[PDB]
Write a protein that holds these residues in place. Sequence first.
Motif, PDB file in Angstrom:
ATOM      1  N   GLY C 186      37.119  32.800  45.933  1.00  0.00           N
ATOM      2  CA  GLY C 186      36.894  32.878  47.367  1.00  0.00           C
ATOM      3  C   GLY C 186      35.429  33.016  47.730  1.00  0.00           C
ATOM      4  N   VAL C 187      34.677  33.788  46.944  1.00  0.00           N
ATOM      5  CA  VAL C 187      33.262  33.998  47.244  1.00  0.00           C
ATOM      6  C   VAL C 187      32.455  32.755  46.881  1.00  0.00           C
ATOM      7  CG1 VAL C 187      31.286  35.490  46.768  1.00  0.00           C
ATOM      8  CG2 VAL C 187      33.529  36.476  47.009  1.00  0.00           C
ATOM      9  N   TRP C 188      32.863  32.056  45.817  1.00  0.00           N
ATOM     10  CA  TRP C 188      32.216  30.799  45.448  1.00  0.00           C
ATOM     11  C   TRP C 188      32.462  29.714  46.490  1.00  0.00           C
ATOM     12  CZ3 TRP C 188      28.564  29.029  42.363  1.00  0.00           C
ATOM     13  CH2 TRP C 188      28.502  27.660  42.093  1.00  0.00           C
ATOM     14  N   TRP C 189      33.590  29.790  47.203  1.00  0.00           N
ATOM     15  CA  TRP C 189      33.800  28.915  48.351  1.00  0.00           C
ATOM     16  C   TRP C 189      32.835  29.239  49.480  1.00  0.00           C
ATOM     17  CZ3 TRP C 189      39.867  28.804  48.744  1.00  0.00           C
ATOM     18  CH2 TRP C 189      40.343  27.928  47.765  1.00  0.00           C
ATOM     19  N   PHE C 190      32.498  30.518  49.648  1.00  0.00           N
ATOM     20  CA  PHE C 190      31.522  30.886  50.665  1.00  0.00           C
ATOM     21  C   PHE C 190      30.114  30.514  50.223  1.00  0.00           C
ATOM     22  CE2 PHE C 190      28.817  33.843  53.042  1.00  0.00           C
ATOM     23  CZ  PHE C 190      29.256  33.566  54.322  1.00  0.00           C
ATOM     24  N   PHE C 191      29.861  30.538  48.910  1.00  0.00           N
ATOM     25  CA  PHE C 191      28.576  30.095  48.379  1.00  0.00           C
ATOM     26  C   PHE C 191      28.365  28.604  48.612  1.00  0.00           C
ATOM     27  CE2 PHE C 191      25.888  28.498  44.909  1.00  0.00           C
ATOM     28  CZ  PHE C 191      24.775  29.292  45.071  1.00  0.00           C
ATOM     29  N   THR C 192      29.377  27.786  48.322  1.00  0.00           N
ATOM     30  CA  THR C 192      29.205  26.340  48.425  1.00  0.00           C
ATOM     31  C   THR C 192      29.314  25.860  49.866  1.00  0.00           C
ATOM     32  OG1 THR C 192      29.951  24.212  47.606  1.00  0.00           O
ATOM     33  CG2 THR C 192      31.617  25.846  48.099  1.00  0.00           C
ATOM     34  N   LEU C 193      29.680  26.749  50.786  1.00  0.00           N
ATOM     35  CA  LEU C 193      29.660  26.369  52.191  1.00  0.00           C
ATOM     36  C   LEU C 193      28.240  26.403  52.732  1.00  0.00           C
ATOM     37  CD1 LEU C 193      31.286  25.515  54.615  1.00  0.00           C
ATOM     38  CD2 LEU C 193      31.531  27.916  55.234  1.00  0.00           C
ATOM     39  N   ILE C 194      27.474  27.430  52.368  1.00  0.00           N
ATOM     40  CA  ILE C 194      26.135  27.584  52.928  1.00  0.00           C
ATOM     41  C   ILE C 194      25.147  26.678  52.205  1.00  0.00           C
ATOM     42  CG2 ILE C 194      24.385  29.246  53.612  1.00  0.00           C
ATOM     43  CD1 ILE C 194      27.077  29.657  54.907  1.00  0.00           C
TER      44      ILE C 194
ATOM     45  N   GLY D  54      27.446  40.087  44.360  1.00  0.00           N
ATOM     46  CA  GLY D  54      28.290  41.152  44.876  1.00  0.00           C
ATOM     47  C   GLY D  54      29.761  40.780  44.879  1.00  0.00           C
ATOM     48  N   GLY D  55      30.058  39.489  45.029  1.00  0.00           N
ATOM     49  CA  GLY D  55      31.436  39.041  44.914  1.00  0.00           C
ATOM     50  C   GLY D  55      31.921  39.016  43.478  1.00  0.00           C
ATOM     51  N   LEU D  56      31.030  38.686  42.536  1.00  0.00           N
ATOM     52  CA  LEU D  56      31.407  38.733  41.127  1.00  0.00           C
ATOM     53  C   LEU D  56      31.524  40.169  40.642  1.00  0.00           C
ATOM     54  CD1 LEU D  56      29.158  35.918  39.554  1.00  0.00           C
ATOM     55  CD2 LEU D  56      31.506  35.739  40.389  1.00  0.00           C
ATOM     56  N   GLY D  57      30.757  41.077  41.250  1.00  0.00           N
ATOM     57  CA  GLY D  57      30.893  42.484  40.921  1.00  0.00           C
ATOM     58  C   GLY D  57      32.230  43.049  41.353  1.00  0.00           C
ATOM     59  N   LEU D  58      32.734  42.598  42.501  1.00  0.00           N
ATOM     60  CA  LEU D  58      34.059  43.021  42.937  1.00  0.00           C
ATOM     61  C   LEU D  58      35.147  42.343  42.114  1.00  0.00           C
ATOM     62  CD1 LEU D  58      35.755  44.638  44.978  1.00  0.00           C
ATOM     63  CD2 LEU D  58      35.585  42.713  46.546  1.00  0.00           C
ATOM     64  N   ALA D  59      34.906  41.103  41.682  1.00  0.00           N
ATOM     65  CA  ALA D  59      35.939  40.335  40.991  1.00  0.00           C
ATOM     66  C   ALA D  59      36.209  40.890  39.599  1.00  0.00           C
ATOM     67  CB  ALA D  59      35.534  38.864  40.910  1.00  0.00           C
ATOM     68  N   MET D  60      35.152  41.291  38.889  1.00  0.00           N
ATOM     69  CA  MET D  60      35.338  41.914  37.583  1.00  0.00           C
ATOM     70  C   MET D  60      35.894  43.325  37.719  1.00  0.00           C
ATOM     71  SD  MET D  60      31.937  40.639  35.538  1.00  0.00           S
ATOM     72  CE  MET D  60      32.390  41.463  34.016  1.00  0.00           C
ATOM     73  N   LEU D  61      35.611  43.990  38.841  1.00  0.00           N
ATOM     74  CA  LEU D  61      36.026  45.380  38.996  1.00  0.00           C
ATOM     75  C   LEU D  61      37.517  45.486  39.285  1.00  0.00           C
ATOM     76  CD1 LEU D  61      35.080  48.343  39.122  1.00  0.00           C
ATOM     77  CD2 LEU D  61      34.671  48.005  41.567  1.00  0.00           C
TER      78      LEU D  61
END
Lengths: 49, 99, 380, 89, 85, 169
Positions: C186-194, D54-61
């Motif tokens: 989900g966060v990588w989707w937000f990364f590739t949006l910007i 910060g998203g990868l930090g939450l994902a591993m946690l």
Amino acid sequence: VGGVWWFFTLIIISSYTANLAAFLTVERMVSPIESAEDLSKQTEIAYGT
Amino acid sequence: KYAYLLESTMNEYIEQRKPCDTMKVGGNLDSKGYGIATPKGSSLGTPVNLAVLKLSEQGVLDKLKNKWWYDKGECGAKDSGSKEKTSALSLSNVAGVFY
Amino acid sequence: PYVMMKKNHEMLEGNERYEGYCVDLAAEIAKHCGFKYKLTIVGDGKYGARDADTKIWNGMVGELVYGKADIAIAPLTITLVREEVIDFSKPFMSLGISIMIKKPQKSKPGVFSFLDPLAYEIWMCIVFAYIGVSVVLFLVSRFSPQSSESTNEFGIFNSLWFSLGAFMQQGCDISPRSLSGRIVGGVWWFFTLIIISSYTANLAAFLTVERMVSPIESAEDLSKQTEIAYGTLDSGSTKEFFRRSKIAVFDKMWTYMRSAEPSVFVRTTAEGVARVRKSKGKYAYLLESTMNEYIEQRKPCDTMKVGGNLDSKGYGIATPKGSSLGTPVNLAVLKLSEQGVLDKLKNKWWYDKGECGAKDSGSKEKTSALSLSNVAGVFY
Amino acid sequence: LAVLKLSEQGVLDKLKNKWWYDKGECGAKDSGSKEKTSALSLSNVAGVFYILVGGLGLAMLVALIEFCYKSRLFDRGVQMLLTTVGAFA
Amino acid sequence: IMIKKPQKSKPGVFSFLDPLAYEIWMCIVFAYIGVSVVLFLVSRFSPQSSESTNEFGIFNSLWFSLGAFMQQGCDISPRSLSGRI
Amino acid sequence: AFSLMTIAVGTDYWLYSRGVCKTVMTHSGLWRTCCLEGNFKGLCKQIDHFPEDADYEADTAEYFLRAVRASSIFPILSVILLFMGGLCIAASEFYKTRHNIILSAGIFFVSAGLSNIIGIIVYISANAGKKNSYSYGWSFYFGALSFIIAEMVGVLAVHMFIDRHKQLT
Ligand SMILES: NS(=O)(=O)c1cc2c(cc1Cl)N[C@H]([C@H]1C[C@H]3C=C[C@@H]1C3)NS2(=O)=O
Ligand SMILES: N[C@@H](CCC(=O)O)C(=O)O
């Protein structure tokens, strides 16, 4: 093959959609004949003095 | 179907003045000049020869040129190049895509 | 190109030594008028403008006042103050004052110009983000729960393929199924949006305002720059033209020519050409119209003509006042104008020495179709 | 009377900008005359990189705290109660 | 009044969310939670091949709507007339 | 990957740019910036987060980015997590048949890269803001390689742990 063609797509599409509004609304003149040499090679028109 | 030949200061005066429906294309095929004419051997020839050089160096002929070609005629296109506006699409703009 | 010596000038002597526009012009005058001529270069080197109070205009006109020379087939401005001392014929060229400056050097071609709207640090840190997310999406998706951990299709090499599919916007057939795996996806989707939309927006910007321009391309633009200083030829009619200034922008130019730090004048026009090249964009030089286009056709093409002519003066063949020889020469100027020779002689020296070959008329249009040379990198 | 002469021809308009601006050296008046397009620098876009790590930090946690839970809404009779407190609030 | 110049302002850490105001980012997340709960509620209405055919739970409907918003679609599609609206 | 980082922490040719060496090209780094091509050559000066015409006052964005940069807490944490990952590898031979130290190792090797990747960013973002035609040298490319090598260890630490509990299965 899929990974590189995707990178080919991302450049060509973004170079396509960069200014697509202006190429549909160009508003340019044709400029058919000029500089008296095209006048020498296009004699459908009539001259006058 | 008719391309007319005339002098340069005529064609600029036609195109600047309304309805402004001709176009000046190309340059000058032969360069020549209007001259104030006096009779040969006149006493009123030599100050006339000096007076044109007075007006040209001081800038009067430049000031007379910027006055008269602007005052009488102004087709609106000659100063409208700076204005840029945006518009919507039309169906005529994208019609082959539908075709 | 008016009069300049041959390449074998040390071998030859006489009238055969010199060549140029005026030498071809002097041949055509005596061909129609019927005399024989002899060329004498002035020892000065200056055109011969107003004298230092001595009144003998130091230069060409002083040779015309002294009776040393008979005619002046030479580049010499027909202005008012020269007319009162010697005779001129009708002009044979039309020319004005023109600002000559350096090239902007804003061309900037490229082969990998598609990697340009992001910096090299970002295209590096995208790959570091691509590898770093792909292994976290792996390490999440493969823990201890046939086996229930085998239900996930997320090996590492499928995780490399999922993160590429999200970044390239194409999408993948696999998608994460666990709550911990949907966070990393989900966060990588937000990364590739910007990051992708920063690319697609800036690549539109680099495909609208890619152009070469000069910021001082007008008369009033050159008047207001103390950074870009400006001077002209010493002991010339151009320098005399700013001494008798009338217009407010011309009076503004005359203020900076007086208060010049250091002195902006040069002894010869080519020294002013060499001064702009050493200044590299921080100094401008005002010389003639027909002189400026000849500089463009020579090496190394590092100048450009900005703006139209300030005025419309001319060059004329000059005789001293009261000379009988000069009245058919006035007819000889009108003959070479009528049979196109003054055009053809100008067609001679301005065509054959076109080594530059640019013919920069320019394209003021902004809607330019993309050439293959722009995007040839992605085909490679 | 001489001041009223000079003010009407615009001499004092011509004198004031000449001494204040032209003798001055600050070129902020023509610095905005030209505009440029530049590449995005990493200082411009780094918050998206900050959310990502910060998203990868939450994902591993979350994968770790659920795993130790397995190594060692809920109970319908109270989820009606949480609905009532939810409906009231 | 005389002050010293601001000398410039750097764009911030979170300057990427400047093209939309902070009212919109609240209303997008409110539109995100609003669509996700409805899309769950539409597809689960008590018709095992009964009630278990649809994959759209609440946690899948969070993942479809965030998938549809970030321009990378997911595997699941609503496959019902009131769901596809 | 531990040896690549501990070099890159210690060595000081991270950045080549035009700068001063006593208070034109420089051997800059995280701590000690140096100089080459000058009358001085190698007179290394410990860099400071100067406020003189930086003009930051209560800028919580700018102060925290530079205080992390002046501390370099992320490249140092990229060392500490990476050594404790190596301590788990050494504790795979001894205290064996525990099988959870192999999971525990792969967390530290991956999180060392997460400590590394944002340590790259806080170095670059604090840098710009002129130093035209700057170069990143090869100290920076050691930590770039210390990123990728540390990941593949954290990759192969997981794939061994896959085989450990498939043996238990
Ligand atoms: N445009 S130019 O400088 O090439 C140029 C300019 C001129 C030329 C010839 C050329 Cl090639 N001849 C004319 C001549 C024709 C008659 C009018 C003026 C003289 C006599 N003078 S000009 O108008 O000064
Ligand atoms: N032909 C010019 C050259 C000097 C100048 O351009 O001012 C003249 O003699 O007047």
